[PDB]
Design a protein around this ligand. Sequence first.
Ligand SMILES: Cc1sc2c(c1C)C(c1ccc(Cl)cc1)=N[C@@H](CC(=O)OC(C)(C)C)c1[nH]nc(C)[n+]1-2
Ligand code: NI
Ligand code: NI
Length: 110
Amino acid sequence: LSEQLKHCNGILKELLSKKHAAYAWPFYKPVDASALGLHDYHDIIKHPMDLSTVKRKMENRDYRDAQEFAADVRLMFSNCYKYNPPDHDVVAMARKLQDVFEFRYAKMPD
Ligand SMILES: Cc1sc2c(c1C)C(c1ccc(Cl)cc1)=N[C@@H](CC(=O)OC(C)(C)C)c1[nH]nc(C)[n+]1-2
Ligand code: NI
Ligand code: NI
């Protein structure tokens, strides 16, 4: 399951890669709610998450198993789906990146 964590790290690297940058970019760093004018963001989203935070957690050996990693990546998407109306541009981006994630996560070594 060090094997499994390596698969997770590969997925993370892919999500951050140029291949997917057109839709991944909003998820690169924490939402800066004040900068964006989203003064209700932290009232609605109790547990912010983004790919830089996932990357720091992976580098620090925070995640003890693949399931913990996947829960954080999915939290990041869920936050987007919670905050924004379903027809929003950023939601379309989240759905695309989540498709990339879920398909490759499903290829986890046993
Ligand atoms: C850096 C980031 S983080 C992010 C966004 C941006 C820009 C965008 C966004 C990204 C891409 C495109 Cl084409 C459009 C919007 N939207 C906001 C919510 C919003 O409504 O913000 C505006 C007030 C529209 C700025 C949002 N929700 N969740 C996330 C992760 N984001
Ligand atoms: Ni550990
Ligand atoms: Ni989960």
